[PDB]
Write a protein that binds this ligand. Structure first.
Ligand SMILES: *[C@@H]1O[C@H](CO[C@@H]2O[C@@H](C)[C@@H](O)[C@@H](O)[C@@H]2O)[C@@H](O[C@@H]2O[C@H](CO)[C@@H](O)[C@H](O)[C@H]2NC(C)=O)[C@H](O)[C@H]1NC(C)=O
Ligand SMILES: *[C@@H]1O[C@H](CO)[C@@H](O[C@@H]2O[C@H](CO)[C@@H](O)[C@H](O)[C@H]2NC(C)=O)[C@H](O)[C@H]1NC(C)=O
Ligand SMILES: *[C@@H]1O[C@H](CO)[C@@H](O[C@@H]2O[C@H](CO)[C@@H](O)[C@H](O)[C@H]2NC(C)=O)[C@H](O)[C@H]1NC(C)=O
Ligand code: EAL
Ligand code: CL
Ligand code: ZN
Length: 604
């Protein structure tokens, strides 16, 4: 570690800790920068030289975290928890967590190589027949092929190309992760991730939430299954069984918006898939990011700075570079550079993604004057919900009309149901998956799920929550969890399930704040500076206050709550139950063992 980046000595008291924290922040910004830059260079231009550079930068981070973490312990272990400055408690608390820096050198190099190589496998896997990439080629197939056999080729190809080679690396990764966090005092890496919510009842609270939401997911499931049955027939849909995992518009069956055309109940109302309008009108990526930006500035939030437009990668390069396509928002920790990396496609759901990713940028912008340690969401769930809150306003028919993507606007119940159904395909269908992914990973980290049951336990969770089955047999050579980006990327997932509930809480608060008197699902906070002021206060707090306190200031409750989500969807909940009863459906999948046959001359 460079001389200038090493800690000195401070007094062993709170006064000295302030100075410690100041000097830490200078050094950290410089180290975070060099690291975020090296990853950027990699993720936008995947080569061996850039990977070796990222690994060297991660190593420098680890030396840093170690020298400053050791020093925080040496000076402040007795006293940091009694400090008067709440923000300084959190900072020192962060600084003393070594994570992977607890590893000895050879194991840090191994850990870093594993992250690098899993990233590269996930992001450069192709399916050949001439080779298709996940984005855009396989995404597109899943979204709008309706050939059972072609969807299967893509689903299986993908899960095979990405899963199988990840498994040896994922096992090694898990061992090293656990080893590292055990020396911070955690029983496993999972306990560490769960500790961010700083809630003794965390697992219980989530299950109380999921139990309240499960009826909606079940009603929707049964409805969609019936729709699928009408198209794909009795051979490939069991009305009493899980849905084949490849028929729902998305590689992970995590969002079902792309099958909207098979379920929409009132096809004579305004068509709420504006994708073809966007294509007809000649939208490009730039436009999408501009329209998101303008939403933000209508709230008196900050615009994207020059550095964002000059630095971002908002399109897949055509120059034959390998990139990580999976959309992400980047803070370089220099208070100046913020960028999005996205292989933006021109569709309505990518319009949401854009807003999602811009939510992150906006958070980065508001809290950039906090100490580096506090430059994060009140919890990771907060960070994920910001863009999604705006996107709820954007998707409303009124707002789509105002940005010229919907030629007229109805305000009738048939339209409301169309709308709420679409939103349910996006939001309610995701709920089981948001919950299940980290359940799988907590199991793996704790040792409940060894390598020999990685795929067994994954599909148990898939069937249990989502009510889907693999469309071909899987076994333990397969590693289907690893064909989902967040797993090889080591990005926690429970934040999304938290986000998907929190976003309706935020929505309801901002709408009330904006003066909006009508049904929640027709609220548009566009141009509400009051709503903006309320959101800004949250963004600016970063992680400097307990999320339960920030939440209470914002929505009046100190806890995640399903009521807003439920009142948002209330009308389509009542509608779906009526339909499912009149069609004599079975809620759930009592024929849990059922799997569909192979197509006749498959794999051809
Ligand atoms: C795991 O399954 C793979 C995939 O094979 C297909 O799906 C299986 C579950 C099986 O039920 C069959 O429907 C299919 O073969 C098996 O892989 C291939 O199977 C044969 C026999 O080895 C052969 O054509 C290939 O070489 C196999 N290898 C691969 C991965 O392409 C595999 O043998 C199964 N068992 C184990 C322990 O991995
Ligand atoms: C992608 O990454 C490679 C490095 O992996 C970059 O290539 C180097 O670029 C400098 C300046 O252009 C040359 O002098 C070196 O000789 C190159 N090294 C290698 C290993 O080729 C390349 O510039 C990057 N490409 C893009 C489009 O950013
Ligand atoms: C669509 O019509 C409904 C029903 O008339 C509107 O909802 C009412 O809105 C007013 C003020 O805007 C409130 O005072 C009422 O309490 C609401 N009543 C009901 C029955 O919900 C709604 O605002 C209109 N929506 C749009 C798209 O603007
Ligand atoms: C598109 C988005 N990308 C992630 C990227 C996360 C990430 C973190 C750290 C490093 C790289 C990428 C993000 O939340 O922005 C994402 O994965 N999202 C959006 C909501 C649900 C979730 C999903 O698609 O699984
Ligand atoms: Cl999380
Ligand atoms: Zn996100």
């Amino acid at each position: 570690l460079d001389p200038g980046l090493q800690p000195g000595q401070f007094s062993a008291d709170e006064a000295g800790a302030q100075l410690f924290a100041q000097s830490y922040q200078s050094s950290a910004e410089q180290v975070l920068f060099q690291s975020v830059a090296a990853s950027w260079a990699h993720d936008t231009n995947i080569t061996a030289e850039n990977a070796r550079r990222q690994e060297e930068a991660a190593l420098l981070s680890q030396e840093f975290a170690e020298a400053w973490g050791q020093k925080a312990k040496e000076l402040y272990e007795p006293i940091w928890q009694q400090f008067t400055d709440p923000q300084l408690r959190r900072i020192i608390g962060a600084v003393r967590t070594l994570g992977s820096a607890n590893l000895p050198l050879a194991k840090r190099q191994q850990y870093n190589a594993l992250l690098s190589q899993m990233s590269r496998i996930y992001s450069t896997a192709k399916v050949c027949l001439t080779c298709w990439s996940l984005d855009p080629d396989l995404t597109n197939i899943l979204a709008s092929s309706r050939s059972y056999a072609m969807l299967l080729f893509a689903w299986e190809g993908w899960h095979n190309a990405a899963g199988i080679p990840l498994k040896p690396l994922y096992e090694d990764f898990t061992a090293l992760s656990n080893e590292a966090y055990k020396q911070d005092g955690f029983t496993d890496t999972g306990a560490y991730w769960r500790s961010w919510y700083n809630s003794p009842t965390f697992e219980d609270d989530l299950e109380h939430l999921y139990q309240q939401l499960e009826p909606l997911y079940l009603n929707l499931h049964a409805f969609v299954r019936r729709a699928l049955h009408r198209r794909y027939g009795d051979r490939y849909i069991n009305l009493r069984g899980p849905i084949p995992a490849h028929l729902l518009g998305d590689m992970w069956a995590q969002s079902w918006e792309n099958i909207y055309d098979m379920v929409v109940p009132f096809p004579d109302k305004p068509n709420l898939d504006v994708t073809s309008t966007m294509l007809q009108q000649g939208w490009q990526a730039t436009h999408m990011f501009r329209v998101a930006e303008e939403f933000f500035t209508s709230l008196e939030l900050s615009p994207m700075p020059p550095e964002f437009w000059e630095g971002s990668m908002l399109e897949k390069p055509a120059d034959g570079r390998e990139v990580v396509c999976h959309a992400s928002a980047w803070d370089f920790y220099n208070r100046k550079d913020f960028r999005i990396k996205q292989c933006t496609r021109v569709t309505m759901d990518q319009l949401s993604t854009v807003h999602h990713e811009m939510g992150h940028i906006q958070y980065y912008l508001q809290y950039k004057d906090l100490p580096v340690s506090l430059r994060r969401g009140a919890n990771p769930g907060f960070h994920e919900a910001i863009g999604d809150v705006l996107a709820l306003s954007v998707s409303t028919p009124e707002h789509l009309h105002k940005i010229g993507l919907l030629d007229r606007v109805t305000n009738d119940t048939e339209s409301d149901i169309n709308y709420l159904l679409k939103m349910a395909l996006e939001k309610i269908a995701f709920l089981p998956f948001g919950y299940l992914v980290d359940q799988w990973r907590w199991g793996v980290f704790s040792g409940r799920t060894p390598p020999s049951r990685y795929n067994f336990d994954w599909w148990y969770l898939r069937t249990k929550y989502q009510g889907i089955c693999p469309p071909v047999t899987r076994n333990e050579t397969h590693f289907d969890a690893g064909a989902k980006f967040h797993v090889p990327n080591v990005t926690p997932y429970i934040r999304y399930f938290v986000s998907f509930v929190l976003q309706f809480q935020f929505h309801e608060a901002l709408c009330k704040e904006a003066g909006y008197e009508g049904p929640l699902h027709q609220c548009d906070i566009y141009r509400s500076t009051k709503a903006g002021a309320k959101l800004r206060k949250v963004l600016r707090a970063g992680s400097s206050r307990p999320w339960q306190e920030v939440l209470k200031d914002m929505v009046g409750l100190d806890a995640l709550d399903a009521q807003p989500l439920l009142k948002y969807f209330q009308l389509v909940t009542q509608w779906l139950q009526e339909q499912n009863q009149q069609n004599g459906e079975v809620l759930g999948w009592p024929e849990y063992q059922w799997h569909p046959p192979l197509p006749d001359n498959y794999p051809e």
